């Protein structure tokens, strides 16, 4: 769910997930994927691409189990798509932390971006 | 792909990428991950971990056109999935060069299985 995803971005970056990434660029947030503005936006771009190949569960409501070992996000086996769902959030949570130096506030708030290419 | 990534390794390290990093340690290779045997192995370990973040990026489309300008890899592909794939290949090529001093040919080909299980990325 958004609880797990938010906890991941918070545990990775230490930042407010809804404040920093609730409406960042043209991929972080709602309304699908658009032409990314930076690397942080590219993370949410791949994140929603990671959601398209998800079948058997809704990424926004279905709660899953993960742990925090050795300062790493460790997904619980749970169910195949739920595991793939957990990996999508973990991937972008790691991705946003690794591009946190490229973060610019001018993109913190977003149909003005070009149509997204196929994943 | 392997062609672009191989080209990057040779341009940074000056070594035949298949000979030196085709089956080195537990993570250098086109197969899988394991416990890093040394620094050069972590380059490949991080490389594989970099790959796992790309799930959803069309596995068939791995060809891209990076640039070798002023002796630096430059990923300029518009496709973000190709952009991040290029950066995954770029990062390991740099890492493989930085850890050339600690390169051990003993790990180059692993005859007996000696790989522990890979810790989570
Ligand atoms: C982007 C397209 C790709 C197509 N392919 C076959 C490439 C890169 C990525 C990847 C990585 O997971 C993928 O499916 O990402 C969505 C897969 C799996 C993969 C690739 N290499 C070059 C790999 C590699 O070389 C050292 C070693 C192990 C796995 C892969």
Swiss-Prot record, chain B:
Important for membrane-damaging activities in eukaryotes and bacteria: annotated segments: 105-117
UniProt main location, coarse: secreted
Disulfide bond residue pairs: 26-115, 28-44, 43-95, 49-121, 50-88, 57-81, 75-86
Outcome after substituting residue 108 to A: Important decrease in myotoxicity when injected into mice. Decrease in myoblast membrane permeabilizing activities. Important decrease in bactericidal activity
Domain of life: Eukaryota
Impact noted for substituting residue 116 to A: No change in myotoxicity when injected into mice. Important decrease in calcium-independent damaging activity against EYPC:DPPG liposomes. No change in calcium-independent damaging activity against EYPC:DMPA liposomes
Effect of residue 42 to A: No change in myotoxicity when injected into mice. No change in myoblast membrane permeabilizing activities. No change in bactericidal activity. Decrease in calcium-independent damaging activity against EYPC:DPPG liposomes
Keywords: Antibiotic, Antimicrobial, Disulfide bond, Heparin-binding, Myotoxin, Secreted, Signal, Toxin
GO BP: arachidonate secretion; defense response to bacterium; lipid catabolic process; negative regulation of T cell proliferation; phospholipid metabolic process
Record note on what altering residue 114 to A does: Important decrease in myotoxicity when injected into mice. Decrease in myoblast membrane permeabilizing activities. Decrease in bactericidal activity. Important decrease in calcium-independent damaging activity against EYPC:DPPG liposomes
Gene Ontology molecular function: any one: heparin binding
Site location (Important residue of the cationic membrane-docking site (MDoS)): 105, 108
Record-annotated site: Hydrophobic membrane-disruption site (MDiS): 111, 114
SUPFAM superfamilies hit by this protein: Phospholipase A2, PLA2
Mutagenesis or variant effect for residue 114 to W: No change in myotoxicity when injected into mice. No change in myoblast membrane permeabilizing activities. Decrease in bactericidal activity. No change in calcium-independent damaging activity against EYPC:DPPG liposomes
Tissue distribution of the protein: Expressed by the venom gland.
Effect of residue 107 to W: No change or important decrease in myotoxicity when injected into mice. No change in myoblast membrane permeabilizing activities. Decrease in bactericidal activity
Impact noted for substituting residue 48 to D: No change in myotoxic activities. No change in calcium-independent membrane-damaging and myotoxic activities. Shows no hydrolytic activity
Family of this protein: Belongs to the phospholipase A2 family. Group II subfamily. K49 sub-subfamily.
Subunit structure: Homodimer; non-covalently linked (probable alternative/compact dimer conformation in solution). Binds to heparin.
PANTHER family: PHOSPHOLIPASE A2 FAMILY MEMBER (PTHR11716), PHOSPHOLIPASE A2, MEMBRANE ASSOCIATED (PTHR11716:SF9)
The protein's name in its UniProt record: Basic phospholipase A2 homolog bothropstoxin-I
Organism: Bothrops jararacussu (Jararacussu)
């Amino acid at each position: 769910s958004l609880f797990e995803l938010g906890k991941m971005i918070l545990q990775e970056t230490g930042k407010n997930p809804a404040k920093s990434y609730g409406a960042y660029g043209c991929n972080c947030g709602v309304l699908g994927r658009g032409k990314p503005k930076d690397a942080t936006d590219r993370c949410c771009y791949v994140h929603k691409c990671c959601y398209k190949k998800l079948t058997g569960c809704d990424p926004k409501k279905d709660r899953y189990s993960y742990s925090w070992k050795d300062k790493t996000i460790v997904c619980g086996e749970n169910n195949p798509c739920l595991k793939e769902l957990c990996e999508c959030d973990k991937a972008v949570a790691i991705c946003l932390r690794e591009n946190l130096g490229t973060y610019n506030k001018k993109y913190r708030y977003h149909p003005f971006c070009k149509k997204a290419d196929p994943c």
